[PDB]
């Protein structure tokens, strides 16, 4: 049925992975995550949308002779957490925020093995910096900053420039999203690449674009 995992280089040691699902009401949808390398170690930012494709990603990483260090999921939705169970099973360390894990638990879902409280966190010897900007797409959505290459992974908190609206807003914090977007613009003024949870990567404009969309939705509402 659905097309398979894609892996694409977007900067030295930074790979965009793209996986697919059908979603009722939305049709065939793709989802982004990253694989980030430091010193031969690979860190997954968001799992693919399926167990199969999570295994494919891990196999790709091993075939490139990288050491797999772990994964972080940037909110609870299945497009970013589908592979947590499989990874757990392989004793690959999975991370999420404590809040994200509570949502997963409340919904009867597999939790990440490690979690963190607080609005910031760092992984892989500080090569990844994690930040909670406040609610937007969801109450728990996180972003991940790669300071060395000034790449911001926005996840579904950040919309692609081709999007006229906010996407799936059934669990959004529409009224909080503008200030959260503003927080992210203030924190990452020099971001060079911004990676949305869905769609095409771009530059810092994705942050401005998402703030406008959030403001528009909040005002309309
Ligand atoms: Cl969408
Ligand atoms: Cl900066
Ligand atoms: Zn989501
Ligand atoms: Zn999403
Ligand atoms: Zn715009």
Q: How many CA atoms lie within 13 A of 94 on its CB side?
A: 27
Instruction: State how many domains the chain has.
Output: 1
Task: Report how far ligand 2's centroid is from the alpha carbon of 8 (Å).
Answer: 25
Q: Which residues of 52-62 are buried (b: 16+ CB within 10 A; e: fewer)?
A: bbbbbbbebbe
- Kindly give the distance from the C-alpha atom of residue 10 to the centroid of ligand 3, in angstroms, as a whole number: 23
Query: Could you list the residue range(s) of the whole structural domain that residue 115 is in?
Result: 1-221
Within its chain, how far is the Cα of 145 from the centroid?
Answer: 11
Among candidates 166, 153, 8, which has minimal Cα distance to 75? 153
Which ligand is the nearest neighbour of the Cα of 151?
2
Which one, of 207, 220, 134, lies nearest residue 176 by Cα? 134
Distance CA 215, CA 116 (A): 30
Nearest-ligand number for the alpha carbon of 192: 2
| Distant-in-sequence, close-in-space partners of 8: CB < 8 Å, separation ≥ 6 | 15, 16, 17, 18
What gap in Å lies between CA 17 and CA 69, rounded to an integer? 17
Separation of CA 211 and ligand 4 centre (Å): 17
Q: How far is the CA of 77 from the centre of ligand 4 (A)?
A: 7
Q: Using CA atoms, how far apart are residues 143 and 195, in angstroms rounded to an integer? A: 10
Sequence-distant (≥ 6) Cβ neighbours of residue 125 within 8 angstroms: 38
Ligand number nearest to the C-alpha of 208: 5
For every residue of the chain, which 3-state class applies, written as one string?
A: CCCCCEEEEEECCEEEEEEEEEECCCEEEEEEEEEEEECCEEEEECCCCCHHHHHHHHHHHHHCCCEEEEEECCCCCHHHHCCHHHHHHCCCCEEEEHHHHHHHHHCCCCCCCEEECCCEEEECCCCEEEECCCCCCCCCCCEEEECCCCEEEEECCCCCCCCCCCCCCCCCCCCCHHHHHHHHHHHCCCCCEEEECCCCCECCHHHHHHHHHHHHHHHHC
Contact (Cβ atoms closer than 8 angstroms) between residue 32 and residue 198: yes
The ligand with the least distance to the CA atom of 31 is 4
- Nearest ligand to the C-alpha atom of residue 79: 4
CA atoms within 13 A on the CB side of 160: 11
Ligand 1 centroid, distance to 126 Cα (angstroms): 31
Q: How far apart are the C-alpha atoms of 52 and 117, rounded to whole Å?
A: 30
Distance 12 CA to ligand 4 centre (A): 25
- In this structure, the strands spanning 151-155 and 193-196 are parallel
CATH at residue 7: 3.60.15.10
Contacts of 49 (CB under 8 A, 6+ apart): 19, 20, 21, 31, 78, 79, 82
**Is 17 marked within a binding site?**
no
Partner residues linked to 150 by β-bridges: none
Other residues' Cβ atoms within 10 Å of the Cβ of residue 129? 17
Ligand 1 centroid from CA 18, angstroms: 14
Proximal ligand: closest to the CA of 19? 4
Ligand 3 centroid to residue 90 C-alpha, Å: 25
Distance from Cα 185 to the centre of ligand 1, integer Å: 22
Virtual CA dihedral for 138, 72, 194, 198, nearest 10 degrees? -60
Resolution in A: 1.8
Q: Is 24 exposed, middle or buried (0-12, 13-18, 19+ CB in 10 A)?
A: exposed
Residues with CB under 5 A from ligand 5 (ion): 209
């Amino acid at each position: 049925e659905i097309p398979g995992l894609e892996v694409e280089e977007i900067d030295n040691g930074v790979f965009l992975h793209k996986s697919y699902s059908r979603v009722e009401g939305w049709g065939l949808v793709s989802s982004n995550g990253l694989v980030v390398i430091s010193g031969g170690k690979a860190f997954i930012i968001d799992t693919p949308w399926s167990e199969s494709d999570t295994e494919k990603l891990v196999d790709w990483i091993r075939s490139k002779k990288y050491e797999l260090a772990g994964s972080i999921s940037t909110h609870s939705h299945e497009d970013k957490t589908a592979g947590i169970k499989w990874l757990n099973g392989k004793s690959i360390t999975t991370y999420a925020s404590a809040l994200t894990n509570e949502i997963l638990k409340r919904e009867g879902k597999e939790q990440a093995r490690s979690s963190f409280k607080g609005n910031e966190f760092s992984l892989m010897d500080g090569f990844l910096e994690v930040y909670y900007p406040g609610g937007g797409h969801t109450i728990d959505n996180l972003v991940v900053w790669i300071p060395s290459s000034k790449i911001l992974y926005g996840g579904c908190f950040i919309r692609s420039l081709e999007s006229s609206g906010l996407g799936y807003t059934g669990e959004a914090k529409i009224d909080q999203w503008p200030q959260s977007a503003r927080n992210t613009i203030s924190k990452y003024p020099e971001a060079k690449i911004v990676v949305p949870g869905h769609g095409k990567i771009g530059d810092f404009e994705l942050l401005k674009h998402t703030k406008v969309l959030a403001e528009k939705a909040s005002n309309k509402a």
